[PDB]
Every structure is written in C-alpha cells, then in structure tokens.
Symmetry: C6
Subunit: 175 residues, 6 copies
C-alpha cells in the first residue's frame, strides 16, 4: 500500500504542529477535484472546531479559503444552522476588508463564550497579506500560492476524498 504509507507517515509528521494550543493555521482548498465535498464539508469543520478551537487557551481561530466559483453564503447558512458563527470579513457585503478578517476575538472564561470559532473567505477577494506571517499553510490540491515564503512551513497534498484528511488530522482512526 504505497499510498496508505504516504498518509500514515504524513500523519506522524504533523503531530507536533498540532500539539500547541495557540497557532496561526491557514488552509486553502480546491473543490472541483474532491469527490462529495458539498455533503462532507460541514461535518469536517465542526469536528475540527471541536478538537482545536473549542477551549479558552485556543486563542487564534483557523482560516479556510477556497478557489473556484463556489457560493459561500449557503455554506454560511448551513454552518449557522449547525451551530457555529464565522467572520466573513465584510461590511456591506461588497468586498473584504483585510483588517477585520485577521482580528482577535472576545473571550470570556467563566462562562466560556467565544465570539467566533472560524474564519471563512474566498481567495480572489482577499487582496494583499497579513502583518504576521502564518505558522502553517496547508495546500490541499493547489499547486501554487502567493503566501509561500522561505520562513513559513508549507504542506502540499492530493486527496481524493475528505476522510483522508480527517485521518491525517487526528479526527478518525481508520483510514
């Protein structure tokens, strides 16, 4: 199983990167080459937020970006009905203001409430870059990107079905 070994060793690589509590993680994806995405995506985001963005010491939420012509509004509605709230980065819905998408949330401890658990954007509309470079960048099926830099960890994969990523990221045991 040459391919299965790829996933197993890749899972063993990324261990220390995800042990930390506070880190700036960023994801990019392309959905035209992932089978059964529209049905499989919300379960994924809820599982990730439940493991790595559902406590106090988890200061910085993740950023999911997408490529293509995908329609985000419907996904925002579905995630809201699921139970989560997102920072779109918009004021009026015209176009993204960078400064808001990359801001710090309000955190209370007793009782724990978190202003938002995730960030959601599209890649084209996000024109520019942040002030503090990302610690990790996860490129799921995208060849090139503009945030690649020498001093940023970078990972690049090709997955056919999302479950594989759920295994790489300690969310389901069986491949």
């Amino acid at each position: 199983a040459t391919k299965g070994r790829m996933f197993s060793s890749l899972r063993k690589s990324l261990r220390s990167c995800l042990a930390h509590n506070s880190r700036w993680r960023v994801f990019v994806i392309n959905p035209l080459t992932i089978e059964n995405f529209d049905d499989d995506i919300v379960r994924f985001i809820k599982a990730f937020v439940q493991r790595y963005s559902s406590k106090y010491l988890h200061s910085n939420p993740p950023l999911f970006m997408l490529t293509g012509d995908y329609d985000l509004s419907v996904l925002q509605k579905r995630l809201y009905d699921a139970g989560l709230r997102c920072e779109t980065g918009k004021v009026g819905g015209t176009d993204v203001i960078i400064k808001e998408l990359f801001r710090r949330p309000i955190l209370i401890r007793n009782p724990f409430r978190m202003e938002f658990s995730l960030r959601l954007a599209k890649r084209d509309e996000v024109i520019g870059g942040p002030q503090r470079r990302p610690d990790e960048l996860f490129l799921i099926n995208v060849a090139d990107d503009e945030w690649k830099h020498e001093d940023v960890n970078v990972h690049g994969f090709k997955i056919e079905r999302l479950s594989d990523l759920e295994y790489i990221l300690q969310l389901r045991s069986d491949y």
Copy 2:
C-alpha cells in the same frame, strides 16, 4: 469470521464520539428480526444509562425510538420496577407533544438527582421534527428514515442479537 472482523473496526470508529459527556444521540430499532428482544432490552437500556447517563455532566438523555406494533405500556413498568423513570411526552393519554419529549431535565448536584434518565417514544406517533438536529443517529436495522441529513452523522447496521451491540458501544469486552 467475517462479522467478527468488521465489528472491531466499528467499535474503534465510535470511540471518539462516546467520550463526550454532553451530546444528543438518537436510536431507531426494529424488533421483528432481532432474536430474543423482549428479554434483553431492559438490561441493554440499564447498562447504557449507567454508562452514559449516570452523572452530572451528562446533560441531555438519549431517545430510543421503536418501529412497529410494539407495546410500550409494559416496558415502562418493567423499567420502573428496575429503577428508571422515563419521559414519553404524553399529557392526557393520546398524543405526543414534540416540545415535551425533548426538554431539558432538572439536575441537582449535591445530592445527585435526575428528573429522568431516558426518553422513549414510538416512531409513528412522533410526527414532526426537532428544533435542533441530532449529532448522531444510530439506525439499527432500519433502511431509511426522514431525519437523515447531510450535516447529521448516520451509522446503519445489521445485528443478529442484542449482545452484538453491547460490544460496539463498550458495554462488554468479549464477544
């Protein structure tokens, strides 16, 4: 055998979910093709309740839903004799009010007291849907249901005897 193998992987598949103290779990069962049902059901429920609805942080109790012409009146008395109080939803005798079958119970810590430990209804009398969606829906031997949804996890199975499921859900440790 073949079935001996699959159940191990399925037992391992659900270890993450059941660790969460708070969750909404829903069970749908069919007793026509389950051998030796009328004898084992009470013990199954008793073990489940002691495992996952016996403490404080176990907030939301589960929902066992049966399909067919079963008789609940006898089961509720057998259970009261065993020591468990149940929530059917009836106020008057005839029909089920969806709002009362999904309410939150009173919880006293010191000394620990529960208003109830389980909720039980027949599937046909429960005409409607819930305000919030279930997290996990176990469909033991039922082909299709109305509450299937993309954003809701679904595990569908076939089992010969109720002893087969106690292994899957960590109530026994052989087979």
Copy 3:
C-alpha cells in the same frame, strides 16, 4: 488446556461488574460436588470480603446461600474466629425473618467501622424474594433457581475445586 481457556474467557466477561463499588450480588452454591470445600470456604470468604467489602463506598454487602443439608453454626463460629461478622437473619428462633436479612448496615466514615460484612443463610429457609431484585445471581453448580428472571443477569458455572473460582473473580493472579 482447553478448559483453562474457558476460565480465561469468563474472567473478562465479569470485569466491569466488579468495578462497581455498590451492587447487590447473590451466590448459590452446592458443596456435594466440590472437592475440599470445608477446607477452603473460609479462605474464600475472607479474600472476597477483603477485596469487595472493606471500604466505605461498598455499601451493599453480599449474600451466600448454601444448598444441601449442611451445618451453618460451625462455619459461623469459624468466621468469628477469623475476625468477621455475619447477618444470619434470625431472632432467637429457627425461622428466618426476611426483612432483617436484607437490611442496610451502619457505616462510620472516620474511623472505619462496619456493623456486618457478609450475609449468610440457607436456601431452604428463605421463603420469598427481595423487593429490589439482584443485579447479579451467580449459580455455582446449581441448575435452576426461583430468582431467575428476564431482567436479572445470570451466570452459571461448574467447578471442580474452589481455587478455580478465585481466578475468575480476580483474587489469585494465576491459574
């Protein structure tokens, strides 16, 4: 050999039950077909009581029922010599008052004191059943008994000598 594997398989079926501090356990035993019973009975009881009936959380004590025409007085005197106390259920006469044999003891947390550790009786002289049915009903070398029911867990064995049981109930580490 193969018979040992039987005992090993049993040792596991019974693990979770004994992990519970409080539970109503019952024993029915037949001495006619056990080897060297009168030589080992007291060692067996003393071990069981030390492991499962010597702490405050262990509120419900066990019952040992012996079938056959046997002499309890001598065993009781031996047990008093051994340091234990018992609850025969009798008040100065032959008859066995049932309400007095299934009562709760007095417990003082600091310092540890216990009114009685074990319950002892003879099956012929018990006419009736407890209001709260037993969680476990072991049946060592007896075929059928009256307290068998659908919602009572039953475990029926055959044993050549008592050293075989101690291994099943986690008193002696090896076979």
Copy 4:
C-alpha cells in the same frame, strides 16, 4: 532450567499478599540444609525490613523463628551493629512470655520512630500459640508445624541458597 520457571511462578502468587501494609507474617527456617546461612542472614533481614517494615502504616512487624540448635545472641549483636532492634520476648530470664513477643509497638509519625522492627525466637522455646492466627505462614525447608490450620494460608518451599528466596519476596530482580 525447569526449576527456575517454578520460582517465577511462585513469585506472582505472592504479590497480593505482600501489597498489604498491615498484615501478620511468620517464618520458620532450618539452617542445616541451606548453604551460607551465617553469611547472608543479616542482609536478608535488612532488605526485608527496609521494604516491608519501614513506615508508619506498617503496623505489625514480622516473626522469624529458627529451629534446631543455634545461637541467637551473636545474631542479635550483629543486627544491633547493623542498626536494627529486636524483640526477644524475655524479661531477663531464660524463659519466654508469649504476650511480650506478640505485643504491639509504639509508633510516632513525626519524626518517625519505631520501638522495634522485628521479632526473633527459637521454636523449641515458644510453648503455646497466638491469640490471633497468622494470615500467612512461610515454612522454609520444614515439613510440619503445630500452627498449621485449615484457615491459614500455608506456603511451602525447598531452597538451597538464600538468594533464591529474595526473588520470591520481590527484592532481587534476577535469579
């Protein structure tokens, strides 16, 4: 060879017995058959007392009896030189008094101090028996004894060197 595995088997039959903090243990030994008794006796008693009689929770110290013709004065002196104190049972004369030997010691917690850490005698001198019977009796290279009873956990071995016994008593790691 095969004998060593027998020793390894005996080693784990005794693990529960010795885990207890308060227990009365007794030993009988026959020097004539053991090689290098005089050379290793003190080392053995010192290890045993370092592990099993060197704390407050360790209430009842052990009892070492030796049969045959042998001198206890030399051993008592060598032990005093080693650092340990012993209870002979004498009140100045040439006769023993059982109450004095089987008495309880003074125990202070802070700073921990023990009136005596062991008991020593010759079997021929001790004419009688104890009020409470031993929980464990270890016969070393002796067949019979008056204190054997159906309600005592008698253990019997045959040894050639004292290094073999230490392994059974969880002191030396290797054989």
Copy 5:
C-alpha cells in the same frame, strides 16, 4: 540504509542532556557543505527556541556561531520579522565584547517576558574565551575548534541537510 541506524543511536545518546532545563549549550556550523541552508536556518532556530527557550525555568539561552564569510545582518532581520530578539555583543562598533554576549537576561515570571531568546555570532570576530567552559559543544561539519577540552562533552557529527539534525535534536517525529 545503514545511515539511519547511526542517527537513531545519536538520538538516544543525547536524551538526558536535553532534558535538563538549564544548561550552557554551544553550536558551531559550517554552511558551505550543507544544501539549502539559507532556507532552513530560520525554521531550525525557531523550532529549537520553542522547546528549550520558551519558559521561565530555561535560564541560559544558547549560542550559534557560524564559520566562514556569512552575512549576519540579513539573518538578524529575518529573525525579527519572525518574532525573535537576539544578542550579538556589538555596542555600536564592529568590535565584539565577551561580557555582553555571555550575559544573563532579565526574566519576569508572571507575565512572561524575556530580554532575549538566542545568541548569534561569527566565529572569527569572537576572540578570547568564556568564564565557564560549556556543558555541551556541537560541531557540525567542523574538524577542530579551540574550546575543545577534556572536561567538555563534545559531540561531532556530519550532515547533508538540516532536516537530519532536527531528528537528532528531537524536533521532528520521523526521518
């Protein structure tokens, strides 16, 4: 091939040394004989700082000394862009002072802040010796250095890529 074993052994030799919280560690590196160094150095240094210089019990920051004609001005800026502060020993002028480099930093516990995390230098510019001979010295592709002494725990390696050393120093999980 066979090369894996050597590194696996080194990884185990150096475990006790890297457990200690406070210790004076020194590093020498020659870049001419390493592939893709400019790209890796920064991630290497950051991964090292996180594990061994990101607490209050981590007293002495480590020292990195390069060999050759390398340009420090660029690296010292890249590290600031990454989020780190360094001590060079320079006071305005081109000359290097021994006292200011081997200096203890201000550490405030609650809240946690550190004057500096790392020390950087070019070998040839550093003339003299320290006050306390180092506890460990690491030679990476260097044959001889003056500080080699008979009371210093030297370790000499030979590497092809920096990812190897991260394995040796416990930074990454697998080769």
Copy 6:
C-alpha cells in the same frame, strides 16, 4: 557479544540500591589498567553527582578512593574549575583525620545549597575504619580490601573503559 549480557545483567542487579536517596557508597579504583582515565574521570564524577547528589533528600555524599601513586591536587583543582567542591579530611597537614572526612554536611532547603558534594582521598593514607559500616562497596579493578565483611554488599567488576560503568550506573542510556 557475550559481554553485552554480562553488563546488562549487572545493570539490572543494581537498580534497587540506587533508587534509594540516602545511603553510604564507597568506590575503590585502580587506574593503572583503565584506558584513558585522566581524560574521562571528571566527566564521570560530574555525571554521577548530578543525579545522585543534587537534591536535598540526598544526605550522605559518596566517597571516591584511588590506589597507587597518583596526584590528587590536580584533579581537585579541575573539579573546582568545573563547579564542584570536595572534602579531603586534611586540617592543613598532609595527614588525614578520619573523623573529619565522614562528617555530615550543612544543608539548607530553600534556597538550596550544599557545603560539599563529594569526598575524595587516597587509600594508603586512610588508616582506620568508619564507625558505621558501608551499605554498598564498589570495587573496580581491585582484588581485596580491608573493609570487606559479611554484612556489606561487596560488588566487584572488571572494565577497561569508564563508559562501561556509566552504562551500569544508569548515566548513559545505551551501551
């Protein structure tokens, strides 16, 4: 080949003695045969002290005795440069006063401090013995000494490099 097992056997034999905190240990050494002694002696002593004489619960420091024509002064100066302090038993004069070498040090808990960490002396000079006998006596490359007695654990080895002992005594992880 076989030597690997001899040393691992010894390593496993002495695991119990060293777990203890307070204890009297003596070493006798004969450098005429050991290869590369002057080079590794100080690293040995520092490693040994860091683990067995660096806490407050470690009351008795160890004693290192060396045989033959050898000059201690230089080693004492070297251990001073390293960061340690030794007790030689000399009140000015060359003669060795025994009552001042086996004394108890001053120990403050918070803040920690040790008056001295190790003892060091030549064997020919020490004329006498201790008031209280030593628990363990490690003889390396020496036949017989005057402190051997039946009530002491007299270990004897034969080694040619000093790392061997570092493995036996648990300072180095792997042979």
